[PDB]
């Protein structure tokens, strides 16, 4: 089997991408944030505290003839950005772009933190990291990909995120028309439950390539590119007027400035992030200070190849017995 779904930016900055997901019988379609940095499929629901729902589409298990309570199961998650949610669990039929999993754990939110409430466009998350990170207790549950894997034509999914435009998540096949050149594959460590890999280095604009190992995660659920402070400083040093603002919480720059591209290494191959991808617009409405899309990972404890990086590539998440990551230009 295969599946193919369009993923759409939630706003003009590509702060996140939403993908429609069919849950239950008859189908209830929710727009979920596909997150290769986490491993829970959780949704706004009829069980979510009413005051914490503000425009989201909810899953109502009682209206699904295929929903079954996962008796005794609870879940609770906190994300790197300080947001969180928690609740109980149903199993139900979940379909993504034509691909159907029966018996998928659908984690129903009883509580969500303010950032989720305040984002009317995201109805929940669909985790695509390794199932070892799943928070369901007492019995850890499998991700949608883990459940589908054995049925897929090939045990892979691909992320093709757009810059200020829709893109595509495919399951079970590699669309050879969706990228240029070849796909370079690189090793993955699953020891922290992430799609964790090592970039071979970087370049700033037309500058020479610096060969240096940068361990990080391929995370579709993180907006920006977070790299070591040395790397980030070297980038913003090439932007006139750029500075790190403690009050704002990262590097800012005058919008009149031209942003250089940023290249990262995948083996001997190179992915070029165009400068425009690194512009996240005014820090506040009307401000001449723009927020940068490359920021320091210091104090996160891990480097994160988030959407800024991934949307410059066609990315293969290869769930073979020994997982690997593939990157192509496009």
Swiss-Prot record:
GO terms assigned for molecular function: aspartic-type endopeptidase activity
Active site residues per record: 35, 199
Domain Peptidase A1: start-end pairs: 17-328
Keywords: Aspartyl protease, Disulfide bond, Hydrolase, Protease, Signal, Zymogen
EC number(s) given by UniProt: 3.4.23.22
GO biological process assignments: proteolysis
Recorded catalytic activity of this chain's protein: Hydrolysis of proteins with specificity similar to that of pepsin A, prefers hydrophobic residues at P1 and P1', but does not cleave 14-Ala-|-Leu-15 in the B chain of insulin or Z-Glu-Tyr. Clots milk
Top-rank taxon: Eukaryota
SS bond partners: 255-290
Family stated for the protein in its record: Belongs to the peptidase A1 family.
Protein name listed in UniProt: Endothiapepsin
Record organism: Cryphonectria parasitica
Gene, per the UniProt record: EAPA
Complete-protein stretch covered: 90 to 419 of 419
